[PDB]
Structure 1
Amino acid sequence: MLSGLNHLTLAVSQLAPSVAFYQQLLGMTLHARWDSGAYLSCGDLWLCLSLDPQRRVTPPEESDYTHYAFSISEADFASFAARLEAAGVAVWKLNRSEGASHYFLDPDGHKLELHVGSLAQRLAACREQPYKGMVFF
């Protein structure tokens, strides 16, 4: 039986800017680094950056909607978004759903998100206003 997400690994084209982005800009904790990767944590999340020459710096129009959302409190959301904006981090989508969301790109074009709100909050909102074809289990 699977008990949760064990780790998220992102392939990166250049290790130093990716470490700078996740540790310094995004505030994650750097636990270890080696010639071809790094381990960081963000709350319970174990993040691995893996240096991969096959990673392309990918424009957002050229990747699908797969994306990785990090939790932040409502109270901290606006100043964190402003930090990303000051750093010139590109946005790939505007928020049109429930709960604050800021959609931003990492240095290689990985699609990231800041989101406020849990699955339970989303399901409650959906029960009141179900999406087209929605069924609950």
Structure 2
Amino acid sequence: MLQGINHICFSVSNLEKSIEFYQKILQAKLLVKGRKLAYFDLNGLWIALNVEEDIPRNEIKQSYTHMAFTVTNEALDHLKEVLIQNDVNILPGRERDERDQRSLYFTDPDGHKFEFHTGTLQNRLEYYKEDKKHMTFYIAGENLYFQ
């Protein structure tokens, strides 16, 4: 089996500009930088940036593939401000239901999509659990009267 997440690595075109984004925006802690790499600690997670300077980065804009980090509601508000102050590319979200809970989607300088999300997986499940529930009328097992 697998023992858990080891690291996540991002291919970047401009190591110094990306180091500043990962520090400023994702609040990652720098550990070591080289000529073509950077390692950071993000709340226990090992994040690596590796340079690929002349590669195409325009189809990445089409895919919803993304990574989300946990934030509170006030934190989301303060981070939207931060992403505005720092000229980050902020994506318009998909439509959301209230029970979806709040998110902010944005990308790094090379198009990797990130999200700040205020909920949990179980919230997302209780949400779907509740709507299954809303579509159930005979609780098999229940006792019916007048029979």
TM-score by length of 2: 0.78
Shift of 1:125: 1.0
Which residue of structure 2 aligns with residue 90 of structure 1?
89
Counterpart residue identity of residue 10, structure 1: F
Q: How many residues align?
A: 129
Assess, with a 3 A threshold, how the Cα gap between structure 1 residues 31 and 78 changes in structure 2: closer, same or farther. Answer: same
C-alpha separation in 2, matches of 1:87 and 1:114: 16
1:66 equivalent in structure 2: 65
Q: Which residue of structure 2 lines up, in the alignment, with residue 135 of structure 1?
A: none
Letter in 2 for 1:119: L
**Given that residues 15 and 49 in structure 1 are in contact (C-alpha distance below 8 angstroms), is that contact kept between their aligned partners in structure 2?**
yes
**Paired residue type of 2:75:** D
Residue matched to 2:7: 7
* 1:10-49 matched pairs, under 5 angstroms: 10-49=10-49
Pairwise CA distance, 1:4: 1.9
- Structure-2 separation of matches of 1:83 and 1:109: 18
Distance 1:129 1:3 in 2: 34
* 1:129 counterpart SS class: helix
| Partner Cα distance (1:101, 1:54) in 2 | 32
Shift of 1:129: 2.5
2:53 alignment partner in structure 1: 53
TM-score scaled by length of structure 1:
0.84
Deviation at 1:63, TM superposition (A): 2.9
Q: Distance in 2 between matches of 1:73 and 1:32?
A: 29
Structure 2 spans left out of the alignment, 5+ residues: 133-147
* Residue-by-residue CA offset, 1:64-117 (whole Å, 9 max, x unaligned): 111111121223110111110121212223252512100001101111111111
Corresponding position of 1:116: 118
The secondary structure found in structure 2 opposite 1:56 is coil
Query: Which sits farther off after the overlay, 75-84 or 14-23?
Result: 75-84
| Structure 1 unaligned spans of 5+ | 131-137
**Cα RMSD (Å):** 1.9
- 8 Å CA contact 1:37–1:51 kept in 2: the answer is yes
1:133 aligns with none
Identity %: 33
